[PDB]
C-alpha cells in the first residue's frame, strides 16, 4: 500500500513519466500522499520535472491544490526552487481546475 | 526499506525501527526530499523514536531537507517540545 506511493513518489522524482504511466493503468490512486502529506506531484514541481508535471496534469487530472505538512501546494516548491516552466503550467492549470 | 524506515519513523514504530537498526540497514538514508526518519519522528513527536534514533543509532541531527530544515525546525514548528529539548541537548553534544 504504501510501498507503492513511494514507488509512485520516487518515479516522480526521478523523471520517469513511463514508470508513473504504468502505475496509473492500473487504476493507482494517483493522488495518494506520503508520510509528509507529499503526493507525486509535490515532488515533480520540487524537482521541476515538466514532463512528469505534464502527465499528471492532463492524463492523471490530479489535484492541484493538495496541501502537504507545511501547507503547501506543488506550485509553491516549483515558486521557491524557480521551476517557472512548472510554475506556467500549475497556475494555468490552477485556474481551470473544474 | 528506503521509506519502510520513514514510515515506522511516522507512526512511532519503535519495534520496527529496532528491527531495521539490527539489519544493518542506513538509518540516515534520505528519501525523495531528502527527508530522513528524524526529520518524520520530529515532525510528529514521537519522543521515543528520536531517542531510539539519537541514542542508539546515533543518526546526524544536522542533515537538511529539500527546504534546508533541520530535524528541529519541524518539532518547533508543530509544538513538540519534549522533541526539542531532546535535539536541542543532542546537537550540543554531536562531538
Given at each position: 500500500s504504501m510501498k507503492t506511493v513511494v514507488n509512485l513518489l520516487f518515479a516522480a522524482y526521478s523523471g520517469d513519466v513511463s514508470a508513473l504511466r504504468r502505475f496509473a493503468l492500473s487504476a493507482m490512486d494517483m493522488e495518494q500522499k506520503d508520510?509528509?502529506?507529499?503526493t507525486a506531484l509535490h515532488v515533480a514541481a520540487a524537482e521541476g520535472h515538466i514532463e512528469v508535471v505534464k502527465f499528471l496534469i492532463?492524463?492523471?487530472?490530479?489535484?492541484?491544490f493538495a496541501k502537504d505538512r507545511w501547507g503547501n501546494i506543488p506550485l509553491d516548491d516549483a515558486v521557491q526552487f524557480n521551476h517557472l516552466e512548472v510554475v506556467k503550467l500549475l497556475q494555468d492549470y490552477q485556474d481551470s481546475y473544474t
Open positions: 508520510y509528509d502529506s507529499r492532463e492524463a492523471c487530472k490530479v489535484n492541484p
